[PDB]
């Protein structure tokens, strides 16, 4: 069986959400491949299927949905509600075979024709990340929408919107202490707002940051990476600035020795 991490938006405080994200990170990496104080997610190639996925159980009103997160990139691939399961379109064959292992005891399995990346989901949702709100409200409503998709109520522009909400508040909060902290400040003051460009460019730059950090000359980037702040305005040439920012990376190369 796969590991399960529990969370509910009913009474969610900065403490409970924080401990939830930290448990998610704990199950994403063993901690055995840390480079520059940043853990590297395990390599996809040699990974047995029995270690490929993580399960996140969300609850609220008390409807529960189980998201499936890919261990190799902390990203959501599908979800389970009741006796139904819905998956994102795989981009090769081995991940599809791995998907068949996720929710084996459900009656109905349906794979969306579209992938899980931000582009396609944005196009389905009618909005893009820059205008969709994040917060405990958006998450609590997202859980209900996901549950009632299998019931037959929710439509696609709402389903995919709830998808990008869950992905940002869970997957990207796990990837970055920065985004986790911003969600903590939204939960603390009951706020609900669109993620400012700092968040969005960090989301778009996760893979490139992984590559540059693992490929650096003892921390020094070979090429500078461009990021943004909150107003939208910089280059990073080193891993030092990113240590309290990024919490998880993809396996790009082998450790140098």
């Amino acid at each position: 069986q796969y590991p399960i991490i529990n969370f509910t938006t009913a009474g969610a405080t900065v403490q409970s959400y924080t401990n939830f994200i930290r448990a998610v990170r704990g199950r994403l990496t063993t901690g055995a491949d840390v480079r520059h104080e940043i853990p590297v997610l395990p390599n996809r190639v040699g990974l047995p299927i029995n270690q490929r996925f993580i399960l996140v159980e969300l609850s609220n009103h008390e409807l529960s949905v189980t998201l499936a997160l890919d261990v190799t990139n902390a990203y959501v691939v599908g979800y389970r509600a009741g006796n139904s399961a819905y998956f994102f379109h795989p981009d090769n064959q081995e991940d599809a075979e791995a998907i068949t292992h996720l929710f084996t005891d459900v009656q109905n399995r349906y794979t969306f024709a579209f992938g899980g990346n931000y582009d396609r989901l944005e196009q389905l949702a009618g909005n893009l990340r820059e205008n969709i709100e994040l917060g405990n409200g958006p998450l609590e409503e997202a859980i209900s929408a996901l549950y009632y998709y299998s019931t037959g109520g929710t439509q696609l522009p709402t389903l995919a919107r709830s998808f990008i909400i869950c992905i940002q508040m869970i997957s990207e909060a796990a990837r970055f202490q920065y985004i986790e902290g911003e969600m903590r400040t939204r939960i603390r003051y009951n706020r609900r707002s669109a993620p400012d460009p700092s968040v969005i460019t960090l989301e778009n730059s996760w893979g490139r940051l992984s590559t540059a950090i693992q490929e650096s000359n003892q921390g020094a980037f070979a090429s500078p990476i461009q990021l943004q702040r909150r107003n939208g305005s910089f280059s990073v040439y080193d891993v030092s600035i990113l240590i309290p920012i990024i919490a998880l990376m993809v396996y790009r190369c082998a450790p140098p020795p």
Epitope: R25, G26, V34, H36, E37, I38, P39, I243, P255
Partner: nanobody, 117 residues
Framework: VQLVETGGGSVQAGDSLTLSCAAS????????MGWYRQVPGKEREPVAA??????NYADSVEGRFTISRDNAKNTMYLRMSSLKPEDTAVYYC??????????????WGQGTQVTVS
């Protein structure tokens, strides 16, 4: 991949001890490190932490404990001054990520007994 400790023992209240932790080369350049402690029957609590450089001390030990590092010898140190009976525990050297050194570390040493009576 290895964390070796030494420096425990039995002292009286008000005395001091200094723990040392020889670390592997890979751990030393890519990991945050720290010191935890545990009494039989209770949970492991973090005591000190060296990150980024950045220090993090538990409220119980701030002002009395000082964590330090020697880059040229692959050894981390914890100086424990003005010891109290509350400090009696098994102390563990630890190494983890930047975020998860203050909670849920990655690597551990054997654990050295510190007795304050």
């Amino acid at each position: 991949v290895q964390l070796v400790e030494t420096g425990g023992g039995s002292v009286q209240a008000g005395d001091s001890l200094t723990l040392s932790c020889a670390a592997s080369e890979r751990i030393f350049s890519h990991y945050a490190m720290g010191w935890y402690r545990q009494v039989p029957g209770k949970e492991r609590e973090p005591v000190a932490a060296l990150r980024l450089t950045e220090t993090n001390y538990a409220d119980s030990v701030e002002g009395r404990f000082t964590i330090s590092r020697d880059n040229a010898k692959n050894t981390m140190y914890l100086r424990m001054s003005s010891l109290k009976p509350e400090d009696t525990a098994v102390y563990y050297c630890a190494a983890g990520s930047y975020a998860a050194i203050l909670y849920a570390p990655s690597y551990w040493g054997q654990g050295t007994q510190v007795t304050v009576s």
